[PDB]
Design a protein around this ligand. Structure first.
Ligand SMILES: [Zn+2]
Ligand SMILES: [Zn+2]
Ligand SMILES: [Zn+2]
Ligand SMILES: [Zn+2]
Lengths: 306, 306
């Protein structure tokens, strides 16, 4: 369950090596094994096309903000989806204007969809409840209304300790069913056993925070708070922190420090400036690591376990 | 002077091997050495970025029609142009709606340009006169208003035959200047020489026809008429001619036959269906060739001399 597949990792504009923003979320569930997409910069559909993922599995698309490097690319994807035989329904979630944009693009281009498409203009707060996980939007600091997304899968109820029960005399099968239900079923050995003393340790869910572009901000800490994996931009190095901050971006240290401040398992930085070359990106990594060793650099097509 | 650089050659949707439509026209002139772009499907700017062409030289963009596979990609290019330091002015020519599309995209995405941008809603007829060449729009048969573009460079006035003059006694230099002007300057050898009898054979210009998507149509022959190079779609093979024609497309034979009918030097087919693989595209080529041997298959990044 839960995989991140980076399609684009470049700030603002594409480069020979990194395409603009798009992050894929593979949700491997027993009955919810679908695909989710966070952002859609130009070329996203191309990027996808080169992977073996089934474009049909993708059912939801979450846009953080409407800047070209996170949005242009969506109209083409929608048309390509339809031109394939995909008919599985699709839902887009994003800030106001998202609907006007998509509609206009489709209108003028003489396009449609042969699959039901639902566009949802969102705002801060819970966005949806899978029944298995919930997504929550958090407002960030950026030139355009921009949301971060916290994806949390509800905690799994603690399961019965089969071994402990077997140890206690309860045989597998018959009264096993009942003890499962909760019944305080008594044993032929003259002894009552309350299944509630064996349904131990209810495993907590995995927590993921995919941020939208942002400079330091209040809500930032909430989104991050103890999440397993935190995806955060690191557009510029420390010496450019002011430049970054002025445009709604964060510096290497700012991201790492927030990681630390929020006690998150792993930090994945992206949206790196086209100004830095491969080595420059390793220098960015070092900056983050020397303030939070558990940081990694995303790359086009790089994968991550939540 | 005059080069075609194909950026995308795929019908409707991108593929692992061919991107959607975009054709580059390199105009190498003594004082007009700029770049021209015909169509802008998604990924066009990416495609460009991988070539050594100076994106700054590009000053004009011609859109045949507004279908996504010829249009999405334009907004991203404009933003990237501006994000570089490009300031050289840019002009877009295309059917109605082109302006509304570009503007809306830029508005919603919170973008601008730091270079003057001129959008021009066109219709049939001459589009511009370079002074060196003229571009003319021709209406075609397709689900959306779609124009073909004839680019003709005016004929070069015949130059003076230096040799013939030297043969006739006229020395290089002095009276050479005058004979150039037209003066019937007389020679010391007692003899008048009218420069008009030496300014021989006025070389005709090169003629290029970049078609937009189309099924057979009346105007098609005009656009094509004797042009040096004819770029025409060949979306489907002969056995699919009806399917093709029903959607505003042409079959292999239809394109070749029009080539022949119009007496054009070379035929370059593109906008091939993602349905055909490499071999299938060679089968498409054969079809064209057996009705007009001078046909070639465009490929992403393939170049052509007009
Ligand atoms: Zn961005
Ligand atoms: Zn942004
Ligand atoms: Zn087309
Ligand atoms: Zn079309």
């Amino acid at each position: 369950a839960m995989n991140l597949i980076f399609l684009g990792t470049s700030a603002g504009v594409p480069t020979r090596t990194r395409n603009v923003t798009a992050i894929l979320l593979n949700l491997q569930h027993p009955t919810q094994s679908g695909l989710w997409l966070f952002d859609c910069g130009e070329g996203t559909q191309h990027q996808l096309l080169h992977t073996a993922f089934n474009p049909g599995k993708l059912d939801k698309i979450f846009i953080s903000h409407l800047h070209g490097d996170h949005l242009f690319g969506l109209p083409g994807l929608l048309c390509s989806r339809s031109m394939s035989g995909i008919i599985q329904p699709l839902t887009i979630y994003g800030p106001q204007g998202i609907r006007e944009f998509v509609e206009t693009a489709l209108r003028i281009s003489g396009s449609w969809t042969d699959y039901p498409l639902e566009i949802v203009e969102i705002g801060a707060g819970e966005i949806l409840d899978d029944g298995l996980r919930k997504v929550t939007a958090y407002p960030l600091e950026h030139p355009l209304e921009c949301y971060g997304y916290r994806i949390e899968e509800h905690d799994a109820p603690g399961a019965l300790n089969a071994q402990a029960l077997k140890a206690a005399g309860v045989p597998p099968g018959p009264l096993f069913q009942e003890l499962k239900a909760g019944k305080t079923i008594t044993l032929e050995d003259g002894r009552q056993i309350n299944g509630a003393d064996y349904l131990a340790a209810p495993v907590p869910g995995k927590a993921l925070a995919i941020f939208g572009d942002t400079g330091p901000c209040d809500a930032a800490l909430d989104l991050a708070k103890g999440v397993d994996v935190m995806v955060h931009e690191a557009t510029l190095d420390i010496t450019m922190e002011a430049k970054a901050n002025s445009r709604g971006h964060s510096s290497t240290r700012q991201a790492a420090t927030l990681a630390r401040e929020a006690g998150v398992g792993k930090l994945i930085i992206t949206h790196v400036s086209s100004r830095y070359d491969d080595k420059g990106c390793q220098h960015l990594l070092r900056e983050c690591r020397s303030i939070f060793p558990a940081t990694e650099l995303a790359n086009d097509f790089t994968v991550f376990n939540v």
